[PDB]
Short mmCIF file of all heavy atoms in Angstrom, two decimals:
data_model
loop_
_atom_site.label_atom_id
_atom_site.label_comp_id
_atom_site.label_asym_id
_atom_site.label_seq_id
_atom_site.Cartn_x
_atom_site.Cartn_y
_atom_site.Cartn_z
N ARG A 1 -88.37 2.85 -119.86
CA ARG A 1 -89.09 3.94 -120.51
C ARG A 1 -90.52 3.56 -120.86
O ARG A 1 -91.42 4.41 -120.78
CB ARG A 1 -88.32 4.36 -121.77
CG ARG A 1 -88.88 5.53 -122.55
CD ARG A 1 -87.85 5.98 -123.57
NE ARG A 1 -88.28 7.12 -124.36
CZ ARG A 1 -88.79 7.02 -125.58
NH1 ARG A 1 -88.92 5.83 -126.14
NH2 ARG A 1 -89.16 8.11 -126.24
N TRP A 2 -90.75 2.31 -121.24
CA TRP A 2 -92.02 1.90 -121.84
C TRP A 2 -92.90 1.07 -120.91
O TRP A 2 -94.09 1.36 -120.78
CB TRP A 2 -91.73 1.15 -123.15
CG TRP A 2 -91.33 2.08 -124.27
CD1 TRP A 2 -91.63 3.41 -124.37
CD2 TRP A 2 -90.52 1.76 -125.42
NE1 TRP A 2 -91.08 3.93 -125.52
CE2 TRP A 2 -90.39 2.94 -126.18
CE3 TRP A 2 -89.90 0.60 -125.88
CZ2 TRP A 2 -89.67 2.99 -127.37
CZ3 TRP A 2 -89.19 0.65 -127.06
CH2 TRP A 2 -89.08 1.83 -127.79
N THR A 3 -92.36 0.03 -120.27
CA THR A 3 -93.12 -0.79 -119.32
C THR A 3 -92.33 -0.87 -118.01
O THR A 3 -91.59 -1.83 -117.78
CB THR A 3 -93.42 -2.18 -119.88
OG1 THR A 3 -92.20 -2.90 -120.06
CG2 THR A 3 -94.16 -2.08 -121.21
N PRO A 4 -92.48 0.13 -117.14
CA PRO A 4 -91.70 0.17 -115.89
C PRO A 4 -92.07 -0.88 -114.86
O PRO A 4 -91.47 -0.90 -113.78
CB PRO A 4 -91.98 1.58 -115.35
CG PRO A 4 -92.49 2.36 -116.52
CD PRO A 4 -93.25 1.37 -117.35
N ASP A 5 -93.05 -1.75 -115.12
CA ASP A 5 -93.55 -2.68 -114.11
C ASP A 5 -92.79 -4.00 -114.08
O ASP A 5 -93.15 -4.88 -113.28
CB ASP A 5 -95.04 -2.94 -114.34
CG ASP A 5 -95.89 -1.72 -114.05
OD1 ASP A 5 -95.49 -0.90 -113.20
OD2 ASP A 5 -96.96 -1.58 -114.68
N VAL A 6 -91.75 -4.15 -114.89
CA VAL A 6 -91.07 -5.42 -115.08
C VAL A 6 -89.72 -5.36 -114.38
O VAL A 6 -88.98 -4.38 -114.53
CB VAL A 6 -90.91 -5.75 -116.57
CG1 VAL A 6 -90.14 -7.04 -116.76
CG2 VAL A 6 -92.27 -5.82 -117.25
N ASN A 7 -89.40 -6.40 -113.61
CA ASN A 7 -88.16 -6.48 -112.85
C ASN A 7 -87.07 -7.09 -113.73
O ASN A 7 -87.09 -8.29 -114.03
CB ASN A 7 -88.36 -7.30 -111.58
CG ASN A 7 -87.27 -7.07 -110.56
OD1 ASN A 7 -86.15 -7.54 -110.72
ND2 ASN A 7 -87.61 -6.35 -109.49
N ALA A 8 -86.12 -6.25 -114.15
CA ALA A 8 -85.00 -6.68 -114.98
C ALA A 8 -83.69 -6.16 -114.39
O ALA A 8 -83.64 -5.10 -113.77
CB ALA A 8 -85.14 -6.19 -116.43
N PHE A 9 -82.63 -6.93 -114.60
CA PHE A 9 -81.29 -6.58 -114.16
C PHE A 9 -80.34 -6.59 -115.34
O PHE A 9 -80.52 -7.35 -116.30
CB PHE A 9 -80.75 -7.55 -113.11
CG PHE A 9 -81.67 -7.77 -111.95
CD1 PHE A 9 -82.00 -9.06 -111.56
CD2 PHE A 9 -82.19 -6.71 -111.24
CE1 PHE A 9 -82.84 -9.28 -110.49
CE2 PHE A 9 -83.04 -6.92 -110.17
CZ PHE A 9 -83.36 -8.21 -109.80
N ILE A 10 -79.31 -5.75 -115.28
CA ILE A 10 -78.12 -5.92 -116.11
C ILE A 10 -77.16 -6.77 -115.29
O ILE A 10 -76.46 -6.28 -114.40
CB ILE A 10 -77.51 -4.59 -116.53
CG1 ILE A 10 -78.43 -3.85 -117.50
CG2 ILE A 10 -76.17 -4.81 -117.19
CD1 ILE A 10 -78.02 -2.42 -117.76
N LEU A 11 -77.13 -8.07 -115.60
CA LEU A 11 -76.32 -9.05 -114.87
C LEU A 11 -74.86 -8.86 -115.28
O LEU A 11 -74.29 -9.62 -116.05
CB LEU A 11 -76.80 -10.47 -115.17
CG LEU A 11 -76.12 -11.64 -114.47
CD1 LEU A 11 -76.33 -11.56 -112.96
CD2 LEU A 11 -76.63 -12.97 -115.01
N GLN A 12 -74.27 -7.81 -114.74
CA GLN A 12 -72.88 -7.47 -115.00
C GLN A 12 -72.09 -7.53 -113.70
O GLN A 12 -72.65 -7.69 -112.61
CB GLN A 12 -72.78 -6.10 -115.66
CG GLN A 12 -72.92 -6.13 -117.16
CD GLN A 12 -71.61 -6.39 -117.87
OE1 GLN A 12 -70.54 -6.31 -117.28
NE2 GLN A 12 -71.70 -6.68 -119.17
N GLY A 13 -70.78 -7.39 -113.81
CA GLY A 13 -69.92 -7.31 -112.65
C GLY A 13 -68.95 -8.48 -112.58
O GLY A 13 -68.84 -9.31 -113.48
N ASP A 14 -68.23 -8.51 -111.46
CA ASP A 14 -67.13 -9.43 -111.26
C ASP A 14 -67.65 -10.78 -110.76
O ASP A 14 -68.86 -11.00 -110.64
CB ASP A 14 -66.12 -8.81 -110.30
CG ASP A 14 -65.41 -7.62 -110.90
OD1 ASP A 14 -65.24 -7.58 -112.13
OD2 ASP A 14 -65.03 -6.71 -110.13
N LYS A 15 -66.73 -11.69 -110.44
CA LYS A 15 -67.12 -13.01 -109.96
C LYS A 15 -67.88 -12.92 -108.65
O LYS A 15 -68.89 -13.60 -108.45
CB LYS A 15 -65.87 -13.88 -109.82
CG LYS A 15 -65.07 -13.96 -111.11
CD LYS A 15 -63.86 -14.84 -110.96
CE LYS A 15 -63.96 -16.14 -111.74
NZ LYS A 15 -63.07 -17.19 -111.18
N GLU A 16 -67.40 -12.09 -107.72
CA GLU A 16 -68.15 -11.84 -106.50
C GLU A 16 -69.35 -10.94 -106.77
O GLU A 16 -70.42 -11.14 -106.18
CB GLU A 16 -67.22 -11.21 -105.46
CG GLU A 16 -66.94 -9.73 -105.69
CD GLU A 16 -65.93 -9.48 -106.79
OE1 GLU A 16 -65.58 -10.44 -107.52
OE2 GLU A 16 -65.50 -8.32 -106.95
N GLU A 17 -69.19 -9.96 -107.66
CA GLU A 17 -70.24 -8.98 -107.92
C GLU A 17 -71.42 -9.61 -108.66
O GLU A 17 -72.53 -9.08 -108.62
CB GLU A 17 -69.67 -7.81 -108.69
CG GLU A 17 -68.57 -7.08 -107.94
CD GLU A 17 -68.10 -5.84 -108.65
OE1 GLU A 17 -68.61 -5.56 -109.75
OE2 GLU A 17 -67.22 -5.14 -108.11
N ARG A 18 -71.18 -10.71 -109.36
CA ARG A 18 -72.28 -11.48 -109.92
C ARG A 18 -72.91 -12.40 -108.88
O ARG A 18 -74.07 -12.80 -109.05
CB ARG A 18 -71.78 -12.31 -111.10
CG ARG A 18 -71.40 -11.48 -112.32
CD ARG A 18 -71.11 -12.37 -113.52
NE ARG A 18 -69.97 -13.25 -113.28
CZ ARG A 18 -68.71 -12.90 -113.53
NH1 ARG A 18 -68.44 -11.70 -114.03
NH2 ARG A 18 -67.72 -13.75 -113.29
N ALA A 19 -72.17 -12.75 -107.82
CA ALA A 19 -72.70 -13.70 -106.86
C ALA A 19 -73.88 -13.11 -106.08
O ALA A 19 -74.95 -13.71 -106.03
CB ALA A 19 -71.59 -14.17 -105.91
N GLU A 20 -73.72 -11.91 -105.53
CA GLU A 20 -74.81 -11.34 -104.74
C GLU A 20 -76.05 -11.13 -105.60
O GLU A 20 -77.16 -11.08 -105.07
CB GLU A 20 -74.39 -10.03 -104.08
CG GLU A 20 -74.59 -8.79 -104.93
CD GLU A 20 -73.40 -8.53 -105.81
OE1 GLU A 20 -72.60 -9.46 -105.97
OE2 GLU A 20 -73.25 -7.40 -106.32
N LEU A 21 -75.89 -10.98 -106.91
CA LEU A 21 -77.05 -11.09 -107.79
C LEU A 21 -77.60 -12.51 -107.80
O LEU A 21 -78.82 -12.71 -107.87
CB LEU A 21 -76.71 -10.62 -109.20
CG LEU A 21 -76.75 -9.10 -109.35
CD1 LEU A 21 -76.49 -8.67 -110.79
CD2 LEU A 21 -78.09 -8.58 -108.86
N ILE A 22 -76.72 -13.51 -107.73
CA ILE A 22 -77.16 -14.90 -107.82
C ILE A 22 -78.02 -15.26 -106.62
O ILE A 22 -79.21 -15.58 -106.77
CB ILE A 22 -75.95 -15.84 -107.95
CG1 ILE A 22 -75.39 -15.81 -109.37
CG2 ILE A 22 -76.32 -17.26 -107.56
CD1 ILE A 22 -74.00 -16.33 -109.45
N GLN A 23 -77.46 -15.20 -105.41
CA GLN A 23 -78.16 -15.75 -104.25
C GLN A 23 -79.28 -14.82 -103.78
O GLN A 23 -80.33 -15.29 -103.33
CB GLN A 23 -77.18 -16.06 -103.11
CG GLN A 23 -76.21 -17.20 -103.42
CD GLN A 23 -75.01 -16.75 -104.22
OE1 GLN A 23 -74.72 -15.56 -104.29
NE2 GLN A 23 -74.33 -17.69 -104.86
N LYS A 24 -79.08 -13.51 -103.88
CA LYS A 24 -80.05 -12.57 -103.32
C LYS A 24 -81.31 -12.48 -104.18
O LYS A 24 -82.41 -12.80 -103.73
CB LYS A 24 -79.41 -11.19 -103.17
CG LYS A 24 -80.33 -10.12 -102.62
CD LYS A 24 -79.59 -8.80 -102.50
CE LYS A 24 -80.50 -7.72 -101.93
NZ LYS A 24 -79.79 -6.42 -101.80
N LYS A 25 -81.16 -12.04 -105.43
CA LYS A 25 -82.32 -11.78 -106.28
C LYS A 25 -82.59 -12.91 -107.26
O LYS A 25 -83.74 -13.34 -107.40
CB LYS A 25 -82.12 -10.46 -107.02
CG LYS A 25 -81.99 -9.27 -106.08
CD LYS A 25 -81.83 -7.97 -106.84
CE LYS A 25 -81.65 -6.80 -105.89
NZ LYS A 25 -81.52 -5.51 -106.62
N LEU A 26 -81.56 -13.40 -107.95
CA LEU A 26 -81.76 -14.48 -108.91
C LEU A 26 -82.18 -15.77 -108.22
O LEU A 26 -83.10 -16.46 -108.69
CB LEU A 26 -80.49 -14.70 -109.73
CG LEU A 26 -80.29 -13.79 -110.94
CD1 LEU A 26 -81.40 -14.06 -111.94
CD2 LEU A 26 -80.25 -12.30 -110.60
N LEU A 27 -81.54 -16.11 -107.10
CA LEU A 27 -81.98 -17.26 -106.32
C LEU A 27 -83.25 -16.95 -105.55
O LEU A 27 -84.03 -17.86 -105.25
CB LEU A 27 -80.87 -17.70 -105.36
CG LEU A 27 -80.92 -19.05 -104.66
CD1 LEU A 27 -79.52 -19.63 -104.57
CD2 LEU A 27 -81.52 -18.91 -103.27
N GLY A 28 -83.48 -15.67 -105.22
CA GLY A 28 -84.69 -15.26 -104.54
C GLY A 28 -85.92 -15.16 -105.43
O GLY A 28 -87.01 -14.90 -104.90
N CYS A 29 -85.77 -15.36 -106.74
CA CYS A 29 -86.88 -15.26 -107.69
C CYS A 29 -87.59 -13.92 -107.55
O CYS A 29 -88.82 -13.84 -107.41
CB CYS A 29 -87.85 -16.43 -107.53
SG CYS A 29 -89.06 -16.59 -108.86
N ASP A 30 -86.80 -12.85 -107.57
CA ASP A 30 -87.28 -11.49 -107.34
C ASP A 30 -87.15 -10.65 -108.61
O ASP A 30 -86.73 -9.49 -108.57
CB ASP A 30 -86.52 -10.84 -106.19
CG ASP A 30 -86.40 -11.74 -104.98
OD1 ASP A 30 -87.46 -12.14 -104.44
OD2 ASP A 30 -85.26 -12.05 -104.58
N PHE A 31 -87.50 -11.23 -109.75
CA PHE A 31 -87.25 -10.61 -111.04
C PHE A 31 -88.24 -11.17 -112.05
O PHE A 31 -88.88 -12.20 -111.83
CB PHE A 31 -85.81 -10.84 -111.49
CG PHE A 31 -85.48 -12.29 -111.67
CD1 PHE A 31 -85.63 -12.91 -112.90
CD2 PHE A 31 -85.02 -13.05 -110.60
CE1 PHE A 31 -85.32 -14.24 -113.06
CE2 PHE A 31 -84.72 -14.38 -110.75
CZ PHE A 31 -84.87 -14.98 -111.98
N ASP A 32 -88.33 -10.48 -113.18
CA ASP A 32 -89.07 -10.98 -114.33
C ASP A 32 -88.16 -11.30 -115.49
O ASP A 32 -88.20 -12.42 -116.01
CB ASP A 32 -90.13 -9.96 -114.77
CG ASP A 32 -91.18 -9.72 -113.72
OD1 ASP A 32 -91.45 -10.64 -112.93
OD2 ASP A 32 -91.74 -8.60 -113.69
N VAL A 33 -87.32 -10.36 -115.90
CA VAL A 33 -86.38 -10.56 -116.99
C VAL A 33 -84.98 -10.37 -116.42
O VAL A 33 -84.80 -9.77 -115.36
CB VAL A 33 -86.64 -9.59 -118.17
CG1 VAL A 33 -85.85 -10.01 -119.41
CG2 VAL A 33 -88.12 -9.51 -118.46
N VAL A 34 -84.00 -10.92 -117.12
CA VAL A 34 -82.60 -10.75 -116.75
C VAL A 34 -81.82 -10.45 -118.03
O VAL A 34 -81.94 -11.19 -119.01
CB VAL A 34 -82.05 -11.99 -116.04
CG1 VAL A 34 -80.54 -12.03 -116.13
CG2 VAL A 34 -82.51 -12.00 -114.59
N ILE A 35 -81.04 -9.38 -118.00
CA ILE A 35 -80.28 -8.92 -119.15
C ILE A 35 -78.82 -9.27 -118.91
O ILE A 35 -78.19 -8.73 -117.99
CB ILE A 35 -80.46 -7.41 -119.38
CG1 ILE A 35 -81.95 -7.06 -119.33
CG2 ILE A 35 -79.83 -6.98 -120.69
CD1 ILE A 35 -82.22 -5.58 -119.29
N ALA A 36 -78.27 -10.15 -119.74
CA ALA A 36 -76.90 -10.64 -119.61
C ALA A 36 -76.19 -10.51 -120.95
O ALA A 36 -76.78 -10.09 -121.95
CB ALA A 36 -76.87 -12.08 -119.10
#
């Protein structure tokens, strides 16, 4: 709502569903903040 320019995720999901967040974006350094 306030600063749309920041890359943040809701790091939710299952053991596999957290993995594709891990290697793709989190390991890819394709984010600014991470919400867990």
Side-chain angles (χ1 to χ4, degrees):
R1 183 168 181 261
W2 285 336
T3 65
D5 291 331
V6 178
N7 198 286
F9 308 129
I10 292 169
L11 183 63
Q12 273 274 347
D14 292 331
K15 305 181 110 203
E16 77 283 10
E17 299 186 358
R18 292 188 297 272
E20 87 273 16
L21 279 184
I22 282 161
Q23 293 82 18
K24 179 180 181 179
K25 299 181 182 181
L26 276 296
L27 195 143
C29 192
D30 313 300
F31 61 92
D32 296 331
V33 192
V34 159
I35 312 170

